[PDB]
Design a protein around this ligand. Structure first.
Ligand SMILES: O=C(O)[C@H]1NC[C@@H]2SC[C@@]21CCC[B-](O)(O)O
Ligand SMILES: O=C(O)[C@H]1NC[C@@H]2SC[C@@]21CCC[B-](O)(O)O
Ligand SMILES: O=C(O)[C@H]1NC[C@@H]2SC[C@@]21CCC[B-](O)(O)O
Ligand SMILES: [Mn+2]
Ligand SMILES: [Mn+2]
Ligand SMILES: [Mn+2]
Ligand SMILES: [Mn+2]
Ligand SMILES: [Mn+2]
Ligand SMILES: [Mn+2]
Lengths: 317, 317, 317
């Protein structure tokens, strides 16, 4: 089935942030048996391998922005690969890698499906521009490069001349927000982006959050869904092996509920499993817990349901 | 009062599953002061002791089904004891022991009250038949033996000739499901059994879940309630000392909410506290935590309320 | 702004209960950078210092009631100080110290604002009278001294002759109740006090709880709000370093939701952050966790929002 036809892309990249280890994300998710688990779930899985991200020496900063050419090139390559997967009639599954890679993932997906809607599960808005950021880390800026309304606010950053903003502010929904920078809050409010911070999740419950999210994106007509999942969207009690953990996150149950509801639309076309850093666990168990949670989230995106699943055969005969 | 008149039955039985220790469940629940705590809560408590489950040697398997005569006999004896407690005008409180004992608990309860409704709190459906089962563990099969709609699907298993299905598919509600076998999911969907998997609990909230459960069972007319509580229905962060723990379970609060709502109907007539295995804690604290949670669940079934409780006297004089 | 104009009062007092260390509450909250964090959040902060609570030797018990003159005097002093802060047009922020200090905090606040409404966030009602109590610990009795309907039920306790009940039973809302004494439950039911025990929080969800709480207190017309926050209202997994921890408490998210909703009314006039005991952590991390949670709660009372915050300037220019 279309909702279970997948194209795996490994994106072992880390230069979008300063913490080493996030490039081991595709390795550890594969080692956990993700591909085998998806095949056992009646999925047609094709593995496009791990993208080679050739080192860019002398990649000097653009103002305070670190490794711009490396980040720009990695996303450019990913865009080409995601577009190839999409042309082959498969749901692209990007194994990250830092969240800067979403520039390439969404850009590439939009080349084949320009009418796509984005669901962004994260503790963070990742909407800083190369001018608003105080960190210069591009994993906290991918949304600004993708939004049409921010054209003219993004300077000419080396490595990003290939980028054409592909999404409007009305085509993105945030879920799980709880650590937003002043500049990002201003952008979020002035552009009128739809969001469900932890405050709205507490107020409404995840059931109403999903009902509202899917109605807001699909109400007019059915359109492709791109889910960009930052594992720090979930509480650090479930995903501790991550760069920027924030307390009071989405529960394991809420994470599974979001992904079960998206699967059920039959419109998931793109998926990013980002910011898994296996060198950031305090214990080996914290790493396995993060990886196992990220695997469980991924399986729910492709049909694994808590009520159970069965093949279309008579089990009583 | 009727809702606080209890008959305690210890059922130290483990042969419905492969892990040793679950037979110590009645011992550890008693040691925690359950009987004394119930009496302090204005309960009339009579202890019927721990059932002697005389060893059945040469109990060869029926196909892949393990210890069928032992499980069949333990349930047959429990049925007789529960029926005796029910005839004495008491709410039967079965301290397990593995969940295979539900065959005897519900069969015995149904002999005195054939119009009973079942609330099944558990991570699992336990509805595998001796033919759909892949483990051959009878604790994953009690429901198949009890359902009228599965008559003709249950083969002649040694030790179970006394069993007559006593409940219809419409007389059972599951709460907490999150680990269902393919065969079980097929049965659950084809028989149209009412269930609230963790997905429905996330969607609706425990308030709506309870409102729907009690309306579905009692809407037509008031009838006796049998609550079969598998401790693995709650999240392993509360009940870790259990045979098959599954992450993303019911919270301590949700567990107390279910039981507070059932007490309030005044219709609880039977209760099973199952799958407490004190040899399965990683630390002694994990065992005490499991036992304390199981005690807390039990006390709420018999009137203990979080808002408080008071005797009908003037406390200001 | 009025909602961000604060008067800090340290109340290092412990004689309302038997566990030493709660007097270090103002010290540890200050060490965590509470004052500096509030100023960074666009707050006008004035620090009235830590109240000196002169030792009262020969403070004999009134029946079973321990240190009545010490508790009575500490609250009398606090009342005078809170009234001073209120007269200076500031929101009084009392850093405790045990909950008996609420006698002084609310009495002092009511002298300037007699039309105030109280939100009491706690696992406990703290409404025992000097005659209903069984421990004789005054931190479990402050509401009894404050209620107009309990005039004639409170005996002449040494150190409390200055007290005039300032609140009616209809002017208080409890949130988080899960450990209520029989006498307290009788008072709660006979006086018809509005409460949301953990049972109502589970039933309704924190969204509906806040909607109902604010409508019940502000429906007729806008009036000042006094929030009396006992850190044991939150689950011990967030606030373990406290005297009376009770499992199944409010989550970190629910705590932040209550305080975000109160800030939003613009009517918070008084705040108590009570029962932080830094000598009651099992590990230093348990103490830092409790302190960090208490700081996070306080910051939300004065505008810190999970969706983000920004200054009224153009961030894109
Ligand atoms: O611009 C920044 O560098 C920061 N702005 C807000 C958050 S705290 C670090 C942060 C980005 C996190 C990226 B990501 O969400 O993908 O992990
Ligand atoms: O048929 C089986 O053996 C399996 N079926 C699904 C679950 S995982 C193991 C299991 C039984 C659960 C038992 B009980 O709920 O009693 O703890
Ligand atoms: O009156 C008493 O001593 C007891 N009555 C109920 C609770 S268990 C301890 C308790 C007081 C809690 C006060 B405080 O909430 O401030 O921590
Ligand atoms: Mn991100
Ligand atoms: Mn993030
Ligand atoms: Mn189970
Ligand atoms: Mn079971
Ligand atoms: Mn208190
Ligand atoms: Mn308390």
């Amino acid at each position: 089935a279309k909702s279970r036809t997948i194209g795996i892309i490994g994106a072992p990249f880390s230069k979008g942030q300063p913490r080493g280890g996030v490039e081991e994300g595709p390795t550890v998710l594969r080692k956990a048996g993700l591909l085998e688990k998806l095949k056992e779930q009646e999925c047609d899985v094709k593995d496009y391998g791990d993208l080679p991200f050739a080192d860019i020496p002398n990649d000097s900063p653009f103002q305070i922005v670190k490794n711009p050419r490396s980040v720009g090139k990695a996303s450019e390559q990913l865009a080409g690969k995601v577009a190839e997967v999409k042309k082959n009639g498969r749901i692209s599954l990007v194994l990250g890698g830092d969240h800067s890679l979403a520039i390439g993932s969404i850009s590439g997906h939009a080349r084949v499906h320009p009418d796509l809607g984005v669901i962004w599960v994260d503790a963070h808005t990742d909407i800083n521009t190369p001018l608003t950021t105080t960190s210069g880390n591009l994993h906290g800026q991918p949304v600004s490069f993708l939004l049409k309304e921010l054209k003219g606010k993004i300077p000419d950053v080396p490595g990003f001349s290939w980028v054409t903003p592909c999404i409007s502010a009305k085509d993105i929904v945030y879920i799980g927000l709880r650590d937003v920078d002043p500049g990002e809050h201003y952008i979020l409010k002035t552009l009128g982006i739809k969001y469900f911070s932890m405050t709205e999740v507490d107020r409404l419950g995840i059931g109403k959050v999903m009902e509202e999210t899917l109605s807001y994106l699909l109400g007019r007509k059915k359109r492709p869904i791109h889910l960009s999942f930052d594992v720090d969207g979930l509480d650090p009690s479930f995903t501790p092996a991550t760069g920027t953990p924030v307390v009071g996150g989405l529960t394991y149950r809420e994470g599974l509920y979001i992904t079960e509801e998206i699967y059920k639309t039959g419109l998931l076309s793109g998926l990013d499993i980002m910011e898994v850093n296996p060198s950031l666990g305090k214990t080996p168990e914290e790493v396995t817990r993060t990886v196992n949670t990220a695997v469980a989230i991924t399986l729910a995106c492709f049909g694994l349901a808590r009520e159970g699943n069965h093949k279309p055969i008579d089990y009583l005969n």
